[PDB]
Amino acid sequence: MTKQIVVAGALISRGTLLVAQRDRPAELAGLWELPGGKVTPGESDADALARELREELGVDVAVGERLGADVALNDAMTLRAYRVTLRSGSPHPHDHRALRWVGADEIDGLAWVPADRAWVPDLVAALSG
C-alpha cells in the first residue's frame, strides 16, 4: 500500500518486552514505542531493523517473524513490527528519552505512540508464550 516502510522490533527477554520512550518530534516525545526506523534503499527489513537497534540501543539482535498487522502511518509510510531476540549487549538509550522492560500487565496501559497501540494484543500474546 505504500512505498516507504518503517520497521520496529519487539524484543522480548526474560518474559518482558523492551519499550523505548521517544524524545522527538514534539508530537511523539514522551510516548512509548517499539524501537526501529525507516528501511533505506538497498536494505532488507532485517538489515534495517538490526541496524536501527544497533544504532539506537547498542545491541545485536536476530530478526524473527512478523508481529501483528502492518499499520498505515500516513499516505506515505507503513509500520511493521518483527519479533527480535537479543544476541549480544544491554539496551542503552542513545536516542530515546528512556527505556523500560514491561510485562503483560503493563502493555495495555502504557502511553504508546498512537500507531503502536494496535499491537497491544499481539504483544501480550507474545509475552504469554
Ligand SMILES: Nc1ccn([C@H]2C[C@H](O)[C@@H](COP(=O)(O)OP(=O)(O)OP(=O)(O)O)O2)c(=O)n1
Ligand atoms: N514504533 C514506531 C516507530 C516509528 N513510528 C513512526 C514515527 C515516525 O512518524 C515514523 C518514522 O520513525 P523514525 O523513528 O524512523 O523517525 P525518524 O523521522 O527519526 O527517521 P529518520 O530520522 O531516520 O528519517 O514512524 C511509530 O509510529 N512507531
